[PDB]
Design a protein around this ligand. Structure first.
Ligand SMILES: [Zn+2]
Lengths: 1112, 50, 196, 98, 98
């Protein structure tokens, strides 16, 4: 059932079949942009989904704006039908040439003059648009960008309920939150004053505004006769009269203004019926209509609040106060009456990139149309043209600044394809337009019974942003409004239905959802009469096998993409599983990757959709292949070529390459991988290698999470990685002159510049050591001069007649390696450069790092560690057949952390590596009844896969471990339990007891040791603070916190603190004298007065406060 | 083997037209080569295939 | 809890206290407990109008058992809490002096720390409480320059009082009082640290 | 501002003028010195950019960036170094590996 | 050298400020916007605080290193390291008490 053509074959412990393949993992990201721009494919998809009105994003935003007009009504403008054009240049050049992948858009604007009756219509240019590539990313200025979705509370009506501590009576509060406008709060209180708070005003009785509209008092009485408390309020109000009511409302809203009937009458419609001032999203209107069951039969077109909505809301509130279960309104079907919850996914919508870009372009359009309307009103009416009206600067500036500074525009982390995919699938909850860290409640960070199937509960950042950053589920798809959905198959009469439907939160709550793992007969008959089920909220209980309505699709319907590829996830702990999931997103691409021996079946699919692996479009036959490019011949006679980037610096400093895995003369079918990117092996993810592990404390070198590695890994490049640095220098013009890169440099020996070429740059392929010169340049000197008279003089004379300083770029502190390539941009060659620059050159330095001491390693079960020591290959313990182990793990950390899953993973890995053959001559053993018939016979170095929540059981492992194929020597190493006899490498005698061994997948984290190690004895000093610089790159000293001062005081150590505060941080003469004394044999002179104290003095003397010293 | 010399190539992080794998892969493959030395001085070999 | 204890604010529990030793004459109000104690030597009854939502604590008897209920008509020792909670340090200080409040604070902090299982020596807490309660509020200045109601350390107040008395000037009437860490640290002798 | 206003005062008194303008200008000068020794102490603080209050002379002492506090947060020292730590069982108690 | 028995804060006086400073600023002009040099007696003039560079007279008459604490008559400046610029002050003169 391998959907892709030529994926590697790896039989799986399959017991249940999923009736649908995993949907396009990046479809969610691309669909928003496709809807926004508007394409035939999106229109066809929308028509298939059944939506009556196919409406794009640009068309909608710039159609709801038009027709603009002047207040006099003698002029108007309209413009619709936005359309796009082709690309400027391919993505490769745009990324390499520093350009921006974009495309122009043209809008056909029609210019109509009312009083005359003329039409002026022609195309208009409206800037460029940052188009989205096929991998769901934005290329801005050559740097990758990815926008993350956001979680917002859908605009609507929420019925809150707070219990009084003294009265102990229910107070039902209803609050409406539209997209923009006034907020209405109707709350029944102990005093019974059912009032309103329009724009955080005083609680004015609802009846006052109800009558302000002219609502007849008799209609109030009859429609509220069933209500008793509200009837009491009606009998309690004093002011009566439409004019009096509206004037009182106006005074409460705007006091101190001429109270007139017309003013209040116009303000009512302006604040509640003027669409521009008061607007709600179509999602909000639809949700409110569904909540009240009013206006359900028609497609929402008007997006303004209506009076019937308000009267229905107050009726609902009073009925809820009465304690009724369900309420009905004329024209509305029966619906339940209950309070709403903020943390329910039936209210929290999802705004994709489409919504954000639409809002930004809406702001830009508003800014443009304001000036356009002002210009048309003020400009001459005769020879005015739309070309002269439309201004393109505001919209382009808005989009540019949104892409640049908006917090929702983050660099796409590209340590490995999995990290990029996770970032593209991320669900942010903070940032602009959202709650802050301090104001956000702690409860929102907890799980909700409605999260099942929509947001993974495991994957989450470890830092303080816990619970605010989730991830889509495997099968989750966003509905066209923004409410996440989840597939389900509906049971009609106790028989499973192959056909599936998608349900949202509200509909899911209103139905009965079965359990996927519940046994089901092949004919669709429920073998068990009682099947567990999930209910409204936090309720699970067995029910007859008939009333059940819905059933899930797969057991893996609630896990994230990252968490979906952690074997034996049903045995670890929540914290450990989360830690492992977070660790999986920090691997480092190695040089020679190997696919895992044990891993879920969602590896190849997660790699094909990652975009970092090329794939043929049409089934053709390869003519020839090369390390740099490939040429495939289509069956239609069209030759096509694919170019593969080799050794290009990744967005996070790692390397990226592609190696074709195809041979010359093979008819490659469409959809078959052709090249493997970083962290890949035959078109499937591979973030690490396979090492033979042993679990036993060894001389305390593996004490407290430490790790020991055999030198075989070091000397075989098993865990060798490649890291590429990047440096750049620029020569920008100055008032004193222009700097130029030149090979020559004042007062430098020939040896120092022996590497620079004629043009003034280091030759490619030349080794560079720390402190070496990387590119030379000369900085002119400052000499006062005449602007125009000496400018004439210097043009004709005085050439190179003043001085030049040296400011050449040098390798920072702690870098080395080869020089792989040099990129130079020149303004002469007509290359776009930032303003005020002439020559910007960047140099790439690539260094090969071998795993060493102080390096982090961690498996897929979240068990970090450090390389305590790398013993020689001749010292590690070895099996009875002479096979030395490669790594030793401690045992005390397994049961306390409670991550027993890794033990099972190691056992299964050993079983798969050694190969097994289960006896079947006498028949299938009872423990092997459910094993797939093709999984009973394996080969050495076989591949196995255990899907999450459905894998080999304990009995399966027990049986398999008892039938492993013997070694070529004829003997079996491990026992049935899985332990084995070792031999000490030092003593040479066997250990008294057996130990566990096996192959476990090991990754490599990004927290290397070379970055951390740093020293500083004497170096550059800051000029403004007189303190040493900071940071490893700047070669600066370490910080000295105040807690250290407290500790030093605690010991009573005085002279040490004096030195630390005076003689090594501030005192200039002190530093010079102590350095000279150390250079010689003289004793260190006592420190002096720190610069801080003298600065404090000379500063406090500036406030007329005579600060004496009183040395006496 | 101690050190190699590839004509027309200046360093190891690159490729060479006509081959299917880059310089790093061929270095890794050559690491498996096994040779026995009778002389106690650096000797030189050649590998010409077109 | 430790923060509140050291800060010496109004206890949240605010348990009733035995201001005087006498024969407890308590009438149990189901809404608000009313507590009165007849003095043994003589005098009036101190009246407490406490909230009745709690469950009365042990009465001080020869057995001295926690299971016992607060029995009316018994006798209690001065300063004892009548019900569970925490006694305001100011009240116990004014009615007992500094030693009792010092030992009570030390015992309370030690108890809360041992609740978690950690152990620390008492002297580390004595060194702190010694500084915390080293202020003598003054009600009247009389023959003294300092403003009445101004905090003065005990040593300097005593020195000035003895100096003024030795010359015949009337003494200044002042009493000891404690404060929280913030107020105890905000008032110092060196101006530079205060500015810091 | 202060120097400019003082020079305006000097020039005006040299030129000669009635009492009102002297005083009006003097009141102005008094405000500038008060502002310089402290901005926002009393009245509307002066704001040039983005309606942002300016950092007066007295602001060098109060606040988190006040020079008093910053002398206690610590300084960057020389002869330092940081690195990862790995347990070593081959060392005596009064020993360490560098 | 480093003996500070006590520290007392006294309230200064006009004569005290006269004593402390070494100049009397007169113009608000900052560093020149063209030649990037202080203006005559401006807010940075070397005649007040000290030389912009170390051991460098304004006019170049005493620009040799062999001049410590020496005043140039041509430009009326002193010759000492740039650090001295950090420890000398200026006092403005007021035409009206404040
Ligand atoms: Zn001079």
């Amino acid at each position: 059932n391998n959907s892709v053509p030529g994926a590697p074959n790896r039989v799986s412990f399959a017991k249940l079949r999923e009736p649908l393949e995993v949907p396009g993992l990046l479809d969610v990201q691309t669909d928003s942009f496709e809807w926004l721009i508007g394409s035939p494919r999106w229109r066809e998809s929308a028509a298939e989904r059944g939506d009556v009105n196919p409406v794009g994003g640009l068309e909608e935003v710039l159609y709801e704006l038009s027709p603009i007009e002047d207040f006099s009504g003698s002029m108007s403008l309209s413009f619709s039908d936005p359309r796009f054009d082709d690309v400027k240049a391919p993505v490769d050049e745009c990324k390499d040439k520093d350009m921006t992948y974009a495309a122009p858009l043209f809008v056909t604007a029609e210019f109509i003059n009312n009083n005359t009756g003329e039409i002026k219509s022609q195309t208009v240019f409206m800037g460029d648009f940052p188009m989205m590539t096929e991998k769901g990313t934005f290329i801005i200025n050559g740097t990758e960008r990815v926008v993350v979705s956001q979680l917002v509370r859908s605009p609507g009506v929420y019925f809150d309920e707070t219990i009084d501590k003294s009265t102990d009576k229910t107070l039902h509060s209803v609050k409406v939150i539209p997209s923009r406008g006034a907020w209405l709060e109707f709350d029944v209180d102990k005093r019974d004053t059912v009032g309103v708070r329009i724009d955080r005003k005083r609680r004015q009785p609802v009846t006052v505004l109800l009558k302000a509209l002219g609502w007849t008092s008799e209609q109030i009485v009859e429609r509220f006769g069933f209500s008793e408390i509200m009837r009491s309020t009606l009998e309690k109000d004093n002011t009566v009269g439409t004019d009096e009511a509206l004037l009182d409302i106006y005074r409460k809203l705007r006091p101190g203004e001429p109270p007139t009937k017309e003013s209040a009458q116009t303000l009512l419609e302006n604040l509640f019926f003027k669409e521009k001032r008061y607007d709600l999203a179509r999602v909000g209107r639809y949700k409110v209509n569904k909540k009240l069951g009013l206006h359900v039969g028609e497609p929402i077109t008007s997006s303004t609040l209506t009076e019937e909505d308000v009267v229905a809301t107050i009726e609902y509130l009073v009925r809820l106060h009465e304690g009724q279960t369900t309420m009905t309104v004329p024209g509305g079907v029966e619906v339940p009456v209950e309070t709403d919850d903020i943390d329910h996914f039936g209210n929290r919508r999802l705004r994709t990139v489409g919504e954000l870009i639409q809002n930004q372009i809406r702001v830009g359009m508003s800014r443009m149309e304001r000036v356009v309307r002002e210009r048309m009103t003020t400009q001459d009416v005769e020879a005015i043209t739309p070309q002269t009206l439309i201004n393109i600067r505001p919209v382009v500036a808005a989009i540019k600044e949104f892409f640049g500074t908006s917090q929702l525009s983050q660099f796409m982390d590209q340590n490995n394809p999995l990290s990029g995919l996770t970032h593209k699938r991320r669900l942010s909850a903070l940032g602009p337009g959202g709650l802050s860290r301090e104001r956000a409640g702690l409860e929102v960070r907890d799980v909700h019974p409605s999260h099942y199937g929509r947001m993974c509960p495991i994957e989450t950042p470890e830092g303080p942003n816990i619970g605010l950053i989730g991830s889509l589920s495997v099968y989750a798809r966003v509905n066209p409004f923004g409410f996440i959905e989840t597939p389900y198959r509906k049971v009609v009469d106790g028989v499973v239905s192959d056909e599936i439907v998608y349900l949202t939160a509200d509909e899911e709550d209103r139905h009965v959802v079965a359990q996927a793992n519940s046994p089901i007969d092949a004919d669709g008959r429920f073998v068990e009469p009682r099947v567990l089920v999930r209910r409204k909220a936090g309720e699970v209980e067995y029910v007859p096998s008939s009333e059940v309505d819905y059933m899930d699709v797969s057991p893996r319907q609630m896990v994230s993409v990252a968490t979906a590829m952690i074997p034996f996830l049903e045995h670890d702990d929540a914290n450990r599983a989360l830690m492992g999931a977070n660790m999986q997103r920090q691997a480092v691409p190695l040089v020679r990757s190997e696919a895992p021996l044990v891993g879920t079946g969602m590896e190849l699919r997660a790699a094909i959709d990652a975009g970092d692996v090329v794939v043929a479009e049409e089934s053709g036959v390869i003519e020839e292949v090369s390390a740099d490019y490939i040429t495939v011949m289509h069956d239609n006679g069209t030759r096509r070529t694919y170019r593969m980037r080799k050794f290009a610096r990744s967005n996070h400093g790692t390397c990226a390459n592609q190696c074709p895995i195809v041979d010359a003369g093979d008819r490659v079918e469409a959809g078959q991988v052709i090249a493997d990117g970083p962290c890949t092996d035959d078109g499937e993810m591979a973030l690490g290698k396979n090492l033979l592990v042993a679990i036993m404390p060894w001389e305390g070198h593996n004490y407290e999470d430490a790790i020991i590695l055999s030198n075989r890994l070091v000397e075989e490049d098993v865990l060798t990685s490649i890291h590429i640095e990047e440096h750049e220098i620029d020569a920008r013009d100055t008032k004193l002159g222009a700097e130029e890169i030149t090979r020559d440099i004042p007062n430098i020996s020939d040896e120092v510049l022996a590497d620079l070429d004629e043009r003034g740059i280091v030759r490619i392929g030349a080794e560079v050591r720390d402190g070496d010169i990387l590119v030379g340049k000369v900085t002119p000197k400052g000499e006062t001069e005449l602007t125009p008279e000496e400018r004439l003089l210097r043009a004709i004379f005085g050439e190179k007649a003043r001085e030049v300083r040296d400011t050449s770029l040098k390798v920072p502190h702690g870098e080395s390696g080869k020089v792989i390539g040099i990129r130079v941009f020149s303004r002469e060659d007509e290359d776009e450069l930032p303003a005020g620059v002439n020559e910007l050159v960047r140099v790439y330095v690539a260094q090969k790092r071998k795993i060493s001491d102080g390096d982090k390693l961690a498996g897929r079960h979240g068990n970090k560690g450090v390389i305590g020591k790398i013993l020689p290959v001749e010292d590690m313990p070895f099996l009875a057949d002479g096979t030395p182990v490669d790594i030793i793990l401690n045992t005390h950390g397994v049961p306390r952390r409670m991550n027993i899953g890794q033990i099972l993973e190691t056992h299964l890995g050993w079983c798969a590596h050694s190969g097994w053959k289960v006896d079947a001559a006498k028949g299938v053993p009872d423990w092997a009844a459910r094993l797939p018939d093709e999984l009973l016979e394996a080969q050495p170095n076989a591949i196995v896969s255990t899907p999450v929540f459905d894998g080999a059981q304990e009995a399966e492992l027990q049986g398999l471990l008892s039938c492993t194929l013997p070694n070529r020597d004829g003997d079996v190493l491990v026992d049935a339990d899985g332990k084995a006899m070792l031999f000490d490498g030092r003593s040479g005698e066997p250990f008294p007891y057996p130990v566990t061994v096996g192959y476990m997948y090991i990754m490599k984290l990004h927290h290397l040791v070379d970055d951390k190690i740093h020293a500083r004895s004497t170096g550059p000093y800051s000029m403004i603070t007189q303190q040493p610089l900071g940071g490893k790159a700047q070669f600066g000293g370490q910080r000295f916190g105040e807690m250290e001062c407290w500790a030093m005081q605690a010991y009573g150590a005085a002279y040490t603190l004096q030195e630390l505060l005076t003689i090594k941080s501030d005192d200039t003469v002190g530093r010079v004298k102590v350095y000279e004394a150390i250079v010689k044999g003289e004793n260190i002179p006592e420190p002096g007065i720190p610069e801080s104290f003298k600065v404090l003095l000379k500063e406090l003397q500036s406030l007329c406060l005579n600060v004496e010293v009183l040395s006496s | 083997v101690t050190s190699i010399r590839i004509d027309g190539v200046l360093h190891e992080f690159t490729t060479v037209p006509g081959v299917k794998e880059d310089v790093t892969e061929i270095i890794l493959n050559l690491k498996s080569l096994v040779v026995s030395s009778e002389e106690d001085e650096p000797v030189t070999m050649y590998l010409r295939k077109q | 809890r430790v923060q509140e204890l050291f800060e010496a604010r109004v206890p949240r529990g605010k348990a009733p206290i035995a201001d005087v030793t006498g024969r407890v004459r308590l009438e149990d109000g189901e809404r608000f407990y009313k507590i009165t104690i007849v003095p043994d030597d003589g005098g009036e009854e101190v009246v407490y109008d406490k909230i009745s939502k709690r469950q009365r604590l042990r009465v001080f008897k020869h057995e001295d058992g926690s299971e016992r209920v607060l029995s009316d008509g018994d006798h209690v020792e001065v300063g004892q809490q009548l019900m569970e909670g925490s006694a305001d340090p100011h009240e116990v200080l004014r009615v007992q002096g500094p030693r009792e409040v010092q030992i009570h604070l030390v015992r309370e902090v030690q108890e809360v720390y041992r609740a978690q299982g950690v152990s620390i020596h008492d002297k580390h807490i004595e060194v702190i409480v010694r500084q915390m309660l080293r202020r003598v509020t003054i009600i009247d200045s009389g023959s003294t320059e300092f403003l009445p109601g101004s905090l003065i350390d005990r040593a300097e107040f005593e020195a000035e009082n003895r100096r003024v008395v030795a010359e015949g000037g009337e003494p200044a009437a002042g009493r000891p009082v404690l404060m929280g860490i913030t107020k105890a640290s905000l008032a110092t002798d060196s101006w530079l640290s205060a500015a810091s | 501002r202060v120097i400019n206003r003082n020079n305006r005062l000097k020039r005006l008194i040299d030129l000669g003028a009635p009492e009102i303008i002297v005083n009006n200008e003097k009141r102005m000068l008094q405000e500038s010195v008060d502002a310089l020794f402290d901005n926002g102490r009393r009245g509307r603080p002066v704001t040039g950019p983005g309606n942002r209050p300016l950092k007066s002379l007295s602001d060098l002492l109060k606040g988190k960036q006040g020079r008093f506090r910053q002398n206690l947060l610590g300084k960057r020292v020389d002869y330092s170094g940081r690195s990862v730590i790995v347990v070593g069982p081959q060392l005596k108690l009064h020993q360490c590996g560098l | 050298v480093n003996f500070f028995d006590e520290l007392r804060i006294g309230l200064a006086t006009a004569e005290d400020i006269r004593q402390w400073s070494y100049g009397e600023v007169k113009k608000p002009e900052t560093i020149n916007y063209r030649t990037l040099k202080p203006e005559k007696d401006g807010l940075f003039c070397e005649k007040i605080f000290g030389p912009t560079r170390d051991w460098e007279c304004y006019c170049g008459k005493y620009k040799r290193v062999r001049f410590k604490g020496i005043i140039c008559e041509r430009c009326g400046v002193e010759v000492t390291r740039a650090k001295v610029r950090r420890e000398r002050m200026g006092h403005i003169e007021l035409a009206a008490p404040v």
